Structures are given as C-alpha cells and as structure tokens.
Amino acid sequence: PDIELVYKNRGFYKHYGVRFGGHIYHLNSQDILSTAITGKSDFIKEEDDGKWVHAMTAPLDYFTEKYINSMVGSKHIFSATSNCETIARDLFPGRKEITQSKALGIIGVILLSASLLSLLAV
Amino acid sequence: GSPDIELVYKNRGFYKHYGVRFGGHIYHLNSQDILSTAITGKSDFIKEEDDGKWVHAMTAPLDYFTEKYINSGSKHIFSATSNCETIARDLFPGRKEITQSKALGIIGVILLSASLLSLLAVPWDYSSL
C-alpha cells in the first residue's frame, strides 16, 4: 500500500505528515528552520482534524529513492512516544526488517526533506 | 553522447554549498546561507575559477539530477551576468532548445535542492545525493 503525504501551510513553508487511516504521523516542530539546525525531532501520531491538504500518494520506494539517497543516512535524531509504536506495521507492513527506530528515521527524513524543499515554492 | 555533470561542494559545517564544475570553473549561487537564500526566493549565479578547494560530490548524467530534484514546483528566480552566458553550451552541449534562462533554472534548482537537503546529512558524507 502507498504512502499518502499531506501538509499544512505554515506561511513560508509547508509542514508535512503521513496520513494512515484516521491519523497523521508528523513531527512536533515549531518551525522547519529551528528543527533543521537543532538536528532533533519528536514524532506525533494525531487524529486527522480534517484540515490537512493532500500532497501526493505514491509507493514508499518512490519517496525513499528520492530522499533517502544514502545508506549512511541522516544526522537528525528522531524520537517517538508509544502511540507511534504502530508506525512500522502501518507504513512498512510487508517489511519485517524495519524496526521502529529505522521507521522513524526513514519517515522523518522524508517529512523534513519535503518541508525544506517547500521553501522554494515561495 | 553528452558528458556527465560534476557536482562539487564546499562544506559550511551545518550544510554543503554545491556547484557544478566544468573545465576550470565552478557555477554556483551567490549565497551566504542556504535557508536565507530559499526564503528570499531569488539568487544570482556566479562562474568562478576553480581555487582547488571544492570537494567532489558526484558525477552523473543530467537526468539523474533532474529526476531527483526537478521531478518535485520551485518558484525561485535565478539570474546571472554575461559571465554565465556559457552555461547552456557548457552543461547542455548541442541542445539548442536549452536557453540561458532554462539552463539557470535547471542547474539552480539542483544546487538549491542539494544544498537544502544537506542540512539533514552527516557532514562528511560527500556522496550524500
């Protein structure tokens, strides 16, 4: 099953999330600039409030090929509370090898990457 | 067939400032800070003689870079002086349909995108594209 990227407009950028069923997985971030420099983010799993905008639905491998272009990976440190312990099964169902830590890293870099590039859409 | 494009960079610590190396010169953006540049939404191109301090990132066909970075709405405006009037012939040889404006737009989005995404990369990973 595909990944659905969604966003909320935050004026000078878009804040992205992954919609799965009735929830959105996204980062607790006051703003992308601060987040990018500080190098750490906490994940939230929140009920869909109906105010997210559809961005794109595509296979996970479309997004990982585009943004996870390194078997070395990110400097960014991702954490999550236990309500995110569904993320591996939800977003990587077929993939037994994906631990929660790996899942957060992959999804987190996708969301941060999308948010950073949204700076160019003015 | 056309030569591959050589992406190079200078490390700025928190991110990498990328350029395209062709012969003895580097095409890159006049930018003190990548996030500042992205917010401003406009930048000027520079063509500079290679000072020997650029780091090799990746050599690849143009369409490797365009598939990765142009296949995802930039409204950034790229300008150049006549010092960049070689950019189309240098980086898009024998493609008459690539005007100067188009060449700046394509190379600009690649450099801005690579630079922005390097904010998330470990800073020593040269091949982080």
Residue numbers in the entry:
A (entry chain B): 1 to 122
B (entry chain A): -1 to 70, 73 to 129
Task: Quote what the paper states about this structure.
Parechoviruses, including *Parechovirus A* that infects humans as well as *Parechovirus B* (formerly Ljungan virus) and *Parechovirus C* (formerly Sebokele virus) that infect rodents, belong to a group of picornaviruses whose 2A proteins, instead of being proteases, contain a conserved H-box and NC-motif and are homologous to a small cellular lipid-modifying enzyme (PLAAT3) that acts as a host factor, enabling the picornavirus life cycle. Despite the common evolutionary origin, 2A^H/NC^ proteins and PLAAT3 have no conserved function, as the active site of the viral proteins cannot support catalysis. Our structural analysis has shown that the topological rearrangement first observed in HPeV1 and leading to the apparent destruction of the active site configuration of the enzyme is indeed a general feature of *Parechovirus* 2A proteins. The C-terminal α5 region, which is a unique C-terminal extension so far only observed in *Parechovirus* 2A proteins, clearly plays a central role in determining the order of oligomerization as well as other correlated and sometimes far-reaching structural rearrangements.
